[PDB]
Amino acid sequence: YLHTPKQGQFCVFQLMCAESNRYSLDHISSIFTNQETLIDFTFTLTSMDIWALWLDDDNQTVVKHINFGQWNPVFVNPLPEDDLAISDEQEPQEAYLECLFAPGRFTIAAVQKAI
């Protein structure tokens, strides 16, 4: 992975050894990225994929993979919504408790830390 200020680039190479113990890189592929910030990447020889993890301009989590120019998206889970709509018929307490204790809704460690 080559980080540049305008655009990122991936390059995949094969290592070649000639009869004279001379090593060279053979060039397999080159893949451009958007203005997203790269956190990590790996690649598999079983599937021939590059797996890559980024943040966008709003700091949301972006994951994509590509067989080594289109990146396949991973549907990452959004964060919970900023505002909770409460009906005129709902007790505010019940609505907020249901949201907070909902499966995958929140992590104990955060609530225990706020208390």
Binding site: D88, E89, E94
Partner: protein, 321 residues
């Protein structure tokens, strides 16, 4: 087990019993009880109110054919026995999921109106206006519904579980209490149609809740095996929680004369339904009565006396104050 202080024979099984909590202008206390297919209205006079009565004077005033098993009875505040303009009004819920409003002059004019719209069994109902114009009902359809006397639905609150008990606030206008089977007690404002507040029980199922008329900050209920008391606005948590019955509590009712006395009933059980009368200052019941199979629990308006319906009998316990 204390014997009942007084016992009155009835024609059939008593499924519900309610004293008139209002002043009817008569010397006797009005009592309603629901059978398999009828509602009886009676006058009760006790030796403790009039020294000319030996024990209990029980007089049937009127019998209404209902045709269905009555599950709850609510008195209208307009109920008067005054000779100038006698008016009997009460509401009933039955196994057919309908409310019936009965009106009578204690003479020949006997009218009833049927109200439909609950999709599940009605568990409880009350008059929810000082003027006696509005009825609140709760049931297994997970609704609390408000009705005029015309049978039009004025309001509907969606509950999170079956509504098990409903009570009008004794002093504060527009405040309805609704007890839900999952342990939540909600308060609704009938002017704003909004939930104001909730309480949560530590045990489930919550089966009955009542307001203390003498101290409107106190709520009592039965949930699981235990009786539970809250004092508002101090906490959403119970102030007291103690065992009421060895196997499932069913009804809770506050005494109308004493803010520290209440009665509980066990569930229609193999060990004959126990009535337990509690005093908050005591860790144990002050009185334990046995009724062979009994449903309904009500307190006399003035006397420290409670009634439970049973197999073809009403059982009365006087509590020494």
């Amino acid at each position: 087990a204390s014997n009942a202080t007084y016992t009155v024979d009835c024609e059939d099984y008593v499924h519900v019993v309610e004293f008139n909590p209002f002043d009817s202008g008569e010397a006797g206390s009005l009592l309603a009880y629901g059978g398999i297919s009828y509602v009886v209205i009676a006058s009760c006079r006790f030796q403790e109110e009039d020294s000319t009565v030996e024990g209990i004077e029980f007089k049937t005033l009127k019998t209404f054919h209902h045709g269905e098993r009555v599950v709850a009875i609510a008195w209208s505040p307009e109920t008067r026995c005054d000779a100038l303009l006698p008016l009997l009004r009460f509401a009933t819920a039955a196994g057919d999921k309908k409310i019936r409003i009965f009106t009578s002059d204690f003479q020949d004019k006997n009218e009833y109106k049927v109200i439909e719209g609950h999709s599940g069994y009605i568990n409880d109902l009350v008059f929810c206006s000082p003027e006696g114009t509005d009825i609140a009902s709760v049931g297994d359809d997970h609704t609390c519904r408000i009705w005029d006397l015309d049978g039009k639905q004025i309001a509907m609150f969606i509950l999170r579980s079956p509504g098990m008990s409903v009570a009008w606030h004794p002093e504060g206008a527009f405040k309805l209490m609704v007890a839900e089977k999952t342990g939540t007690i909600r308060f609704y404002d009938l002017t704003t149609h909004q939930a104001i507040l909730s309480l949560e029980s530590v045990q489930v199922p919550l089966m009955s809740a009542d307001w203390c008329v003498r101290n409107t900050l106190r709520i009592g209920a039965v949930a699981g095996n235990d009786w539970i008391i809250w004092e508002m606005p101090r906490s959403s948590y119970p102030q007291d929680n103690k065992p009421a019955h060895a196997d499932r509590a069913r009804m809770f009712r506050w005494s109308k004369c004493n803010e520290n006395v209440f009665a509980t009933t066990g569930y229609p059980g193999k060990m004959k339904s126990q009535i337990a009368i509690h005093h908050l200052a005591h860790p144990q019941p002050i009185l334990i009565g046995t009724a062979p199979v009994g449903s309904g629990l009500s307190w006399h308006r003035r006397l420290p006396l409670c009634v439970v319906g049973g197999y073809r009998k009403l059982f009365f316990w006087l509590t020494e104050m």
